Write a protein that binds this DNA or RNA. Structure first.
Ligand code: CA
Ligand code: CA
Length: 287
DNA sequence: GGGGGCATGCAGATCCCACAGGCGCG
DNA sequence: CCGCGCCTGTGGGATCTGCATGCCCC
């Protein structure tokens, strides 16, 4: 049990969060929800988040996945209050804005009159993946292509939570095809759907390093932010997350990541014994 | 008396994670 | 040569997202 920084929580919500508006039947029932599902290894984050918001239920989905679900109405107010003070950054903010106007419709109790569900389906048709086939056949009169959020990084604490979700620290070992000497390469990467390309591109100027790699438009719908130059990693990337602590197993991956960075800064990665530890400081992180 | 809210399942779709290899450059 | 690191390319599963349903209560 502990509490995390609010900007770190918002950043992690931009990565793994999901806003849900369920409309099922003609007695149409409604269900507003915020959900996060992770691997069992990161059950601490969900309990860390639940202790911060004092809401939600943490269940087990299968033998490997935990889930945190907030479904009560009065308990969705603290979520909306929090996100109003710490706004989301990715295109998920658009789903949150539709999540909020769906809440105010259900708060005025108008969501049960015939006028209410007609707007909520109109609201639902714009968030996440839209409506189903049946309700789209039950409301082929849906009107309303929402305004696209385009923000930059608000701060580094948002990045700590965001990196704890979609980020990645890992070690590269390359056997030189000419020298047969083991090469060690540290790299930091964040992947993301191309719908937030402007946000991912703003990481370059805010961190002072990194590159954006895309691939052709026909074969891929997600890009990568990546830092491979060791000097940028040791002097820019590492101090950022030393100040803004990551959460979950990403903190453990980052700690082992920094152990390799220091073995390299001490030039011990050229030694036979130093190369042995780095190899273990690579199997550590797969487990 | 039953309607709407809550808790609690289960499952599909995909956007991630954690890499690999070729090769130009200083 | 040689190590660095830009640059292209990716398998597979942890994710994001959706549907269902019996129970409870007021
Ligand atoms: Ca994400
Ligand atoms: Ca993750």
């Amino acid at each position: 049990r502990e509490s995390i920084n609010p900007w770190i929580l918002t950043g992690f919500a931009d990565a793994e969060g999901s806003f849900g508006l369920s409309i099922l039947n003609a007695r149409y029932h409604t269900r507003l929800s915020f959900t996060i599902m992770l691997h069992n290894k990161d059950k601490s984050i969900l309990e860390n988040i639940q202790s911060t918001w004092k809401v939600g239920i943490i269940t087990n989905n299968g033998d490997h996945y935990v889930t945190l679900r907030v479904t009560r109405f009065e308990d969705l107010k603290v979520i909306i209050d929090h996100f109003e003070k710490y706004p989301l950054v990715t295109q998920k903010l658009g789903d949150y804005k539709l999540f909020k106007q769906a809440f105010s419709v259900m708060e005025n109790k108008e969501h049960l009159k015939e006028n209410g569900i007609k707007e909520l389906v109109r609201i639902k048709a714009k968030m996440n993946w839209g409506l189903n086939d049946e309700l789209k056949k039950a409301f082929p009169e849906n009107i309303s292509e929402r305004p696209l959020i385009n923000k930059n990084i608000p701060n580094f604490k948002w990045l700590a939570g965001f990196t704890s979700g979609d980020g990645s620290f890992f070690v590269r070992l390359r056997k030189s095809n000419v020298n047969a000497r083991v090469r060690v390469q540290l790299v930091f990467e964040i992947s993301q759907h191309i719908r937030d390309k402007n946000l991912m591109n703003s990481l370059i100027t805010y961190l002072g390093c990194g590159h954006i790699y895309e691939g052709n438009k026909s074969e891929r719908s997600w890009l990568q932010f990546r830092v491979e130059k060791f000097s940028d990693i040791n002097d820019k990337i590492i101090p950022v997350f030393q100040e803004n602590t990551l959460i979950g197993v990403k903190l453990e991956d980052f700690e082992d990541w920094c152990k390799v960075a220091k073995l390299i800064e001490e030039k011990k990665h050229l030694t036979e014994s130093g190369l042995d530890e780095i190899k273990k400081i690579k199997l550590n992180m797969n487990k």
